[PDB]
Copies of this chain bind each other. A is one copy, B any other.
Amino acid sequence: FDCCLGYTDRILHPKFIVGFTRQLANEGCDINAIIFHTKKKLSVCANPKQTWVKYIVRLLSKKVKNM
């Protein structure tokens, strides 16, 4: 994605996610977004304020501590 202009409505499970990128408003794009990177080598634009989005990011972060 160059800029996310809209968001997915489909909740993903944490096991499917290998990473994320943050898009910030006024840093090249007009809205904020979390871009999830999946095990299928696809990406998904997600609403940063949604619970499931924060949940995946929290779990990814905790795993990195185990590394």
Q: Which residues does A use to contact B, with CB under 8 Å? A: 18-24, 27-28, 32, 34-35, 37, 39, 48-49, 53-54, 57-58, 60-61, 63-65, 67
Contact = CB atoms under 8 A, between A and B. Distances in A.
B67 A61 contact: no
Dominant SS among interface residues on chain A: mixed
Contact of A34 (B20, B53, B64): B64
B54 A22 contact: no
Q: How many copies does the complex hold?
A: 2
11 contacts: A18-B21, A18-B22, A18-B23, A19-B19, A21-B37, A27-B39, A32-B67, A48-B64, A54-B65, A58-B61, A60-B61
Given A19-B35, A22-B18, A28-B39, A58 B67 contact: no
